[PDB]
Amino acid sequence: DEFQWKGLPVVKSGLDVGGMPTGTRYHRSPAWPEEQPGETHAPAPFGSGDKRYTFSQTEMLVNGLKPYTEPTAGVPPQLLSRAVTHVRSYIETIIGTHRSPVLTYHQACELLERTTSCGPFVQGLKGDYWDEEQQQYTGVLANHLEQAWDKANKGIAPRNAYKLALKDELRPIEKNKAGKRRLLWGCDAATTLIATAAFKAVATRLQVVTPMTPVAVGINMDSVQMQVMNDSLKGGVLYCLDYSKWDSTQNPAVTAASLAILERFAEPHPIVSCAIEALSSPAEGYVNDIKFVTRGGLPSGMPFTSVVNSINHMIYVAAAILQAYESHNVPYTGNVFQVETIHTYGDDCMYSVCPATASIFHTVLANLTSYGLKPKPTNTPVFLKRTFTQTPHGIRALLDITSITRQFYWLKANRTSDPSSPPAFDRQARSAQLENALAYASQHGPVMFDTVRQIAIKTAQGEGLVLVNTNYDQALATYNAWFIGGT
């Protein structure tokens, strides 16, 4: 039965999945004992081990889980259905009406991320279990996937189940001082598998075609695909919005609609449909011996989070716009996604709207907020933290300079309760990281690059590294080869 645990509704899971990991993987660079100008980020608060703060992990979790407790208005069902047929229609004209077959078991298995966790029911990394060249999973994980695959083929859906933790990353110091840390949802590998088999061929068709669809997922921002995106912005009125608390504000009816759109492009099959059932069912987060079941929102670690959230976003925007026209008594004649230009990456976005739409944008925004989303114009495209900028070699999607330099001042390494303690890290990975950071720097041009250069040399001697993209010309040449190659 339900009971309250720190003010959240909560049930015993029948299992014990363990506590959230202790400490942090981030150390200050040994090269960098002092604070540098314009630094804005440091390691998120990790509770008991950490001398900076006095927050506990469990309370940071409870904080992050709270919005999942409260449902969201969503879209009025009649509106929703019109919005949906807009979204569906448009994607039909781009990717066609072909229905992708479900993946084989082995195909689906090869796509799992060996680098990540197995979710709440199996310990370790997925790669712990991968046979490099039996070419299959093995052991306890393989049994976990196998039973699930078998059940799915029999119409029995896997658990929409996540191991809850907190993300360990560099965050804004303003946020750290406030006791904020992002939720980590670790999906059950079986559920990932079934989704993958269901939906990956549809996801791939959308990716092949990016950014011709508003699903920008898997766009290479350091390629021509970004210039295609840029070009598509011309003519319209540019709104680059950030949504707050995007994940906790996802309405489950909208989500179910997005999944129904996806299902349209797949073969009907018991797999496809376990997977909708799982993914449209409420997220269950496991900690210790309890689970929390969501009443609203979406877990950030769902299978296909980006695609599903990009479809949600398309549906919300179509609805907001169509509602705004109808309530102003204006006819809306074309497809939203031709009349308007829309790029999403789950919650990240750029809208380039017709002027008629721009005229009544106040009203669009208000419709968005009425769905329980938490949303003026610019000439400067900003997307996936990139700023679109002219350079001497064409438009580039420029990483923030602080995104570049913070990589020099921090490194992800061994667990610790002390970031000021010395890292154990492999020098080659580190050096490759920093040579990449340098190639990004080169696009900012030569004054900017010289500053980053000086940082990198300092870093190299302090950390004992070796670096070539230390010069502008070779840093420029490496980025360029990335750029024209899709590399």
Curated annotation (Swiss-Prot):
Domain of life of the source: Viruses
Stretches assigned to the RdRp catalytic domain: 236-361
Reactions catalysed according to its record: RNA(n) + a ribonucleoside 5'-triphosphate = RNA(n+1) + diphosphate; Endopeptidase with a preference for cleavage when the P1 position is occupied by Glu-|-Xaa and the P1' position is occupied by Gly-|-Yaa
Role this protein plays: Protease-polymerase p76 processes the polyprotein: Pro-Pol is first released by autocleavage, then all other proteins are cleaved. Cleaves host translation initiation factor eIF4G1, eIF4G2 and PABP1 thereby inducing a shutdown of host protein synthesis. This shutdown may not prevent viral mRNA from being translated since viral Vpg replaces the cap. It is also an RNA-directed RNA polymerase which replicates genomic and antigenomic viral RNA by recognizing specific signals. Also transcribes a subgenomic mRNA by initiating RNA synthesis internally on antigenomic RNA.
Domain characteristics, as noted in the entry: Protease-polymerase is composed of two domains displaying two different catalytic activity. These activities may act independently.
Name of the featured protein: Protease-polymerase p70
Gene source species: Sapporo virus (strain Human/United Kingdom/Manchester/1993) (Hu/SV/Man/1993/UK)
